[PDB]
Write a protein that binds this DNA or RNA. Structure first.
Ligand SMILES: [Ca+2]
Length: 68
DNA sequence: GCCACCGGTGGC
DNA sequence: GCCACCGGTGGC
């Protein structure tokens, strides 16, 4: 389920998806959804989309929390 | 053509 | 040996 992510700017949501088949079955992937609905799979991709005005240095992609 | 899904690996 | 990061792609 897509859950609100207050660590991000307004509108952002986070989803954890459990892999269903293959040797990695049971592994989790984390996705973030922009307010406009675009999907992001890594902190570099996320940071490039948001740009310099948003400080993600303390941002922990896997947990979705600021981890300082 | 798109994209959800799993596999591969460079850097640590 | 692990995993952040992203490539390949089958099913639509
Ligand atoms: Ca916020």
């Amino acid at each position: 389920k897509r859950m609100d992510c207050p660590a991000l700017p307004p509108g952002w949501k986070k989803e954890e998806v459990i892999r269903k088949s293959g040797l990695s079955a049971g592994k989790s992937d984390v996705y973030y959804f922009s307010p406009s609905g675009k999907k992001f799979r890594s902190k570099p991709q996320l940071a490039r989309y948001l740009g310099n005005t948003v400080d993600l240095s303390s941002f922990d992609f896997r947990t979705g929390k600021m981890m300082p």
